[PDB]
């Protein structure tokens, strides 16, 4: 209840079937603004801000608490229990895909299906696994972010959007620049340190894996990896959308693909 207020929980739409939209890194729930109109007639939509969002009071971001994805999972389950949700479809972008995977292992009855967008269980390369990033490269990123946060945002946002969609570049820049820099750096280490490979097989809920073309954060092989390793019935959607942020860059097409996945 003070948690619902703290994380800007919003419930809209005319339907009864519950659809949770959970934003990822560098954004807030406003990233779903252009999807949302397509779900109000036939869903009950639940949106919230991760505690790291620039829209959330930075006083709530307890560095002693939010050291792994688990406490983010506790926030998500607290919200669904407080709303009296006993079953939903969940859409998680970026880190929210991994949050939803973990939540479903904790509460396998709460989710009818997960829709994962721009999802990766591991970013760092090793001898047996390609995530797309070297440890040395990530360190240099953290240094740049510390040196000049604004410059870092303005250099990274075009790469994350990927396609030449200047409105989405401005929009992602906007929400990243609203995040407090100390929070952004800490969350960025949470993201790069994540390793969800050992838990994928514990998932038993069906997963739709939405993979864009030329996603700077997620090589194509990682979407294949999720399809092979998630424990339940998996479907890969190879979206006709370029870049990591299809909800910002191609909302009308992403909305129709979500509608299709949520039907069957
Ligand atoms: O240089 C980066 N390259 C990246 O691809 N990411 C990143 C990794 C995972 C993601 O889900 C996102 N994202 O933008 O939602 C971004 C970063 C995430 C935080 C900080 C820096 C970076």
Swiss-Prot record:
GO biological process: secondary shoot formation; strigolactone biosynthetic process
Catalytic residues (UniProt): 94 (nucleophile), 215, 244
InterPro entries associated with the record: AB_hydrolase_1 (IPR000073), AB_hydrolase_fold (IPR029058)
Keywords recorded for this protein, A-Z: Hydrolase
The UniProt record lists the keyword Hydrolase: yes
GO molecular function list: hydrolase activity, acting on ester bonds
Family the UniProt entry places it in: Belongs to the AB hydrolase superfamily.
Record note on quaternary structure: Interacts with MAX2A in a strigolactone-dependent manner.
Protein name: Probable strigolactone esterase DAD2
Record organism: Petunia hybrida (Petunia)
Gene: DAD2
């Amino acid at each position: 209840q003070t948690l619902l207020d703290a994380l800007n929980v919003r419930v809209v739409g005319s339907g009864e079937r519950v659809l949770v939209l959970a934003h990822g890194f560098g954004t807030d729930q406003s990233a779903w603004n252009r999807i949302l109109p397509f779900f109000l007639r036939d869903y009950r939509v639940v949106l919230y801000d991760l505690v790291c969002a620039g829209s959330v009071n930075p006083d709530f971001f307890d560095f002693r608490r939010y050291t792994t994805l688990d406490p983010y999972v506790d926030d998500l389950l607290h919200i669904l229990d407080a709303l009296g949700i006993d079953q939903c479809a969940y859409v998680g972008h970026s880190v929210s895909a991994m949050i939803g995977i973990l939540a479903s292992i904790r509460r396998p009855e709460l989710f009818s299906k997960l829709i994962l967008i721009g999802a990766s269980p591991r970013f760092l390369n090793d001898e047996d696994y390609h995530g797309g990033f070297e440890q040395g490269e990530i360190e240099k990123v953290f240094s740049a972010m510390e040196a000049n946060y604004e410059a870092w945002v303005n250099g990274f946002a075009p790469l994350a959007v990927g396609a030449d969609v200047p409105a989405a570049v401005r929009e992602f820049s906007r929400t990243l620049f609203n995040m407090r820099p100390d929070i952004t750096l800490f969350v960025s280490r949470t993201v790069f340190n994540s390793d969800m490979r050992g838990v994928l097989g514990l998932v038993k809920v069906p997963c739709h894996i939405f993979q864009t073309a030329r996603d700077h954060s997620v090589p194509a092989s990682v979407a294949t990896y999720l399809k092979n390793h998630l424990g339940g019935k998996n479907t890969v959607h190879w979206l006709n959308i370029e870049g990591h942020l299809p909800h910002l860059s191609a909302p009308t097409l992403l909305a129709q693909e979500l509608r299709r996945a949520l039907s069957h």
